[PDB]
Amino acid sequence: MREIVHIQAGQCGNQIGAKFWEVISDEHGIDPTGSYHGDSDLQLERINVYYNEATGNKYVPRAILVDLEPGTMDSVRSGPFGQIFRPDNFVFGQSGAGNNWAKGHYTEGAELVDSVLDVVRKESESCDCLQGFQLTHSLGGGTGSGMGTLLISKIREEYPDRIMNTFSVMPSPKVSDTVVEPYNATLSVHQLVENTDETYCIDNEALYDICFRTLKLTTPTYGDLNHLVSATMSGVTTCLRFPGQLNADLRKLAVNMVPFPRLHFFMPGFAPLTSLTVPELTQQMFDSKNMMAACDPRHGRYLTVAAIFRGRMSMKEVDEQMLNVQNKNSSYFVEWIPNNVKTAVCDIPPRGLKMSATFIGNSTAIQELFKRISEQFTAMFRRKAFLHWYTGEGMDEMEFTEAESNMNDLVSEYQQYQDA
Amino acid sequence: MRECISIHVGQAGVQIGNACWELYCLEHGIQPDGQMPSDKTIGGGDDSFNTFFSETGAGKHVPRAVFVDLEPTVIDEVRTGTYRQLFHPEQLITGKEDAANNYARGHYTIGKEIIDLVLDRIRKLADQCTGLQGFLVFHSFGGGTGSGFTSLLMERLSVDYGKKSKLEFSIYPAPQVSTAVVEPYNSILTTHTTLEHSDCAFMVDNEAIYDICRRNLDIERPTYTNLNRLISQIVSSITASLRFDGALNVDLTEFQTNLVPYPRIHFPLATYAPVISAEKAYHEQLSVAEITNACFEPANQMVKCDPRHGKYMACCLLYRGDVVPKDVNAAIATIKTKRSIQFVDWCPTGFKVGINYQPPTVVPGGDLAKVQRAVCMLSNTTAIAEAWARLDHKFDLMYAKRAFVHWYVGEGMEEGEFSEAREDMAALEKDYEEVGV
Amino acid sequence: MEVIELNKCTSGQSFEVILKPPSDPSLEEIQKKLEAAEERRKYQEAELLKHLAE
Amino acid sequence: MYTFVVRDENSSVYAEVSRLLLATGQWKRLRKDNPRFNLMLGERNRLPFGRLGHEPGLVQLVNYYRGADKLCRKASLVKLIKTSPELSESCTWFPESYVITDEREVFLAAYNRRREGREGNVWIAKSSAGAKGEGILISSEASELLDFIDEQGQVHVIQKYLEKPLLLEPGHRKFDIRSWVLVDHLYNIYLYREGVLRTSSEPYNSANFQDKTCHLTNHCIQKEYSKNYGRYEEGNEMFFEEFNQYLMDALNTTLENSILLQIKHIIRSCLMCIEPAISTKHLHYQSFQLFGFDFMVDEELKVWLIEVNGAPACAQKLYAELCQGIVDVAISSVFPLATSIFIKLHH
């Protein structure tokens, strides 16, 4: 379990993926040109997890960039770390997906998916021990949601024994592009419920709320939201990328975080929120204000939790504070899964900050988010509003009713396990 | 002389084996390159230590061991460590992808692909034995390899060497020092699968070793190195009778004879004293009576439980260092007066005592202080059933909801194996209750 | 308090002390169960591929 | 703050204990099966001692001493007193008792001894199963007692019935004394200042032994089968102030001198005997426990131990003061926050 294959699809997918790659490239001492100028060998011990070692001792991200439009990928190529990516790993069309799930999944995306899979196959062949794939995308648009889910399905068909991990950005009316985002999201969630092992639910509502009422940003841009996202992705991948007592990999994570196959949607959390003592780190990261999914964990229960503390700190006080938070919040953890909280410490803090903490919770409170989507979905579907956009691509009403039913079922399963 | 073969499975088994073989080399005067200057018979011998070390024409003393892991990094550390030249490259066997803390992966999917290779390596070691007593198997309950692959290997060893004895050293899982949430499942699955194939099993609870390190060594957050050096001290106490000239427990069958009156009740409780920090500049060397009494303090046990509330079936005292029978007998009479030691009626109330004059050996630059005398007590007491109960309860909490079961079924197991293993454990607890009160 | 069977050598001594007196599956089955598990897993994988094909 | 779980739903004392703990504001009450607790108010049967003291970062305390049952079951107590050197068969404060390993054969011998002298040969058959004040027969003939023992399925003990008991007047009525004792985690032995006298409402009678109400002084039996209940004293229960006053007025002595010294001695002897078996001083969890000691007082102002209750009920009038005391001494001592009501029996 060494190499991970990274896939970013659509506008949101590629923007957050670009920021992820520049953040971790900085952490590993890799510059925009792909050459290593770091000071610690710890930056290179597991660098193969995300980078291929090319000729001349250059490191190239094991990343595939996908879109049905050339714009966002042009801007990526033009960006700071744009030259770092493998040129023929850019796979894109011209037509676009029109924020339409059917276009990304059934019509437009169908033409490009095999070329994408060819690049994925080439990246996987060079792998000594492939862990699986991580995909960055949004669920509200067309390319990320429709085509990313199509890609996930085809990849699972070709690699049924590898881990499928996604960073999935959920839509909210507070940061809405079009009224059809709930449709696109519901259709995507069904796919995600069946074909991923782990999904980090990045809620645009939560990111906006954090930017507005905590970072005091009056008018939050997409870049502001993305900064939070990249901090979260760095935190959540820290133990995959650096040597630690944990020796973490995607499969161990899945096995220890996912007690029931369908309930694999995690709420990330981060502290401190930016644009600090261990007790503060622990209290903040468990604070709802620090949640990236816009759900109140005090409205549900944690099935499992995984947390990393980064910096120079006493692991003893980290243990003490984690136990203290569990005891002071005993009601919000299920009692029938013993020892369901895992903690690690990494001596290398992220850039600019001396102490930080990242949190992954498999909470039943995530049901709130799905409820939110479902309602927004039904309010339009009950009137069949905007359906012609999708029926013109060949879809039937039955498929919508099926996606709706699957998501309401998911909500009811979360509710079932919330009542122990 | 009769050889013994050590088998170290999974991370816990491999690292504990590293500690153990370091300690053995120190105790027998074998250097990291395998040369043993005190050995005057070159390329062979009939000595007691030859039960654990074969010899090469070049005078190299080679452990009779195989290290197995489904992942390669941990055994890589042995290949490139202080004792790299101690082992033959074929002794260290690794795969590429581990069991992912999943008993089903270790036992069925991944293990099946490597069992024949491991058996071939083990046969390669066995063919060098004039007489082979059996195997010592080191593994954790909690890991996917340590549980699943160890159970598979134990079944195959029963098939291949039915006559031979199989002794276990098992790490019982603890939240203070844990790697997986599903460690209870694995623990039960392997126990049920291994129970009829193991003749005697020494359980070490990570919680007990952790607390002993914290308490007696003043180590705030013990590492696997600390835990493993203490465990190696206990294991060395248990195997010294196999490696040195003596009269008690001089062959693997004797462990079953002396410690195990019933086949399924084959989990003796180990207690060890004294554990003293190397850093303490002031130290008061403890007498025979003191360490013997410490043997009856729950805080010094390898598993936390209360022997006062169980019954003894056998009790064995293994001393090392400045100890003569006179003091042992006096201390035993004192303790018998001062303690609650009830044996089962169908067994005699007696202790079997062994004294090795060589004091305990410590790793230079370790946390354990050098002491003039030490003692490991091995008592087969029903109180250890507490551990089983604890473990079973955790299992029950998760299995009632089928939490995580899908990971095992997806590898080819059936829920029926879960319920069958849990029933076997309930029967085991029933047996312990019947023998005890 | 009776001491019995005292043995001495240069490495040490051993003895016993009485304070009071008293009052397998064949290889065929292994292969069969391993392959039954593998057949269950093969069936599950084929079910997944059937679903993906539809 | 602190957490505690309740597993003995129907016990007055610890119902009040949990009430007061919650009222302190610094204690949460979890579900019965939640393992992350500081305090367990456990069940009376099969309390899972094997599971306590294994939660990292949690100091765990339980209101029962594993092994104390040896003191609180009748036959077990008789065997403990007979086989324990600390308090031998010659110990003077426990009546001549035989378990029925069977002791019938050795009981018939003492019965024959009885027969030679005119001294009374009245005995009482007892069982641990008869908690509901029934399962006892008092007769001078041993064959009757043994026939009863055989008719009953449970295991029994025969005691020497105190034919000359200390009698209160007015009334000529028997009684027994209940003293409450708290053993904390350090094995301090605290005797509650207030004890109770369960008084036979209907006068004593040496002639007939089937007069069950005048021979058996239990609150339930007295309430159900005695014609007058609360005639002499309220609730058929006397408290140490008025009992001491009566001792002074009638016998010119004090409760402390004539009775309480022996009671303190018996409590100390019993609880020091079993200390090595049940102490938790070096255990991964701590125990405290409340006991109810029952005594008789004979005509010569001698005190006899009858039975030890490990799951004792209190007296309505005292529940408040004692329960609080428990918290202050047994619970809050291990879990702090924010003149005594006990007597320390030192040792």
Ligand SMILES: Nc1nc2c(ncn2[C@@H]2O[C@H](COP(=O)(O)OP(=O)(O)OP(=O)(O)O)[C@@H](O)[C@H]2O)c(=O)[nH]1
């Ligand atoms: N005492 C001690 N316990 C260990 C050590 N290494 C792991 N453990 C314990 O073993 C259990 C985990 O099993 P591992 O041995 O790490 O797993 P494995 O056998 O390699 O199997 P995989 O799941 O495939 O990795 C946990 O309870 C750990 O606390 C060690 O070096 N010393």
Ligand SMILES: COc1cc(OC)c(/C=C/S(=O)(=O)Cc2ccc(OC)c(NCC(=O)O)c2)c(OC)c1
């Ligand atoms: C915040 O970003 C994290 C990412 C992680 O992965 C990529 C892990 C974790 C990696 S891992 O490889 O250790 C697998 C794992 C996970 C959770 C567990 O508990 C719920 C356990 N079991 C431990 C127990 O018994 O409590 C094991 C993480 O958490 C230390 C944090």
Ligand SMILES: Nc1ncnc2c1ncn2[C@@H]1O[C@H](COP(=O)(O)OP(=O)(O)CP(=O)(O)O)[C@@H](O)[C@H]1O
């Ligand atoms: N040897 C004896 N001599 C005189 N009276 C005796 C006696 N043994 C028992 N009794 C009487 O028996 C009555 C009840 O006995 P005991 O208390 O042992 O039974 P019990 O345990 O069911 C009720 P509790 O446990 O609540 O006190 C007492 O009031 C006592 O007077």
Ligand SMILES: Nc1nc2c(ncn2[C@@H]2O[C@H](COP(=O)(O)OP(=O)(O)O)[C@@H](O)[C@H]2O)c(=O)[nH]1
């Ligand atoms: N957080 C975040 N969300 C975005 C970003 N870009 C688009 N989105 C969201 O993603 C959804 C739009 O999908 P988009 O990715 O633009 O469509 P695609 O290109 O067709 O996949 C809407 O919910 C947008 O709010 C971004 O940079 N950051």
Ligand SMILES: [Ca+2]
């Ligand atoms: Ca030799």
Ligand SMILES: [Mg+2]
């Ligand atoms: Mg867009």
Ligand SMILES: [Mg+2]
């Ligand atoms: Mg491993």
Ligand SMILES: [Mg+2]
């Ligand atoms: Mg009673």
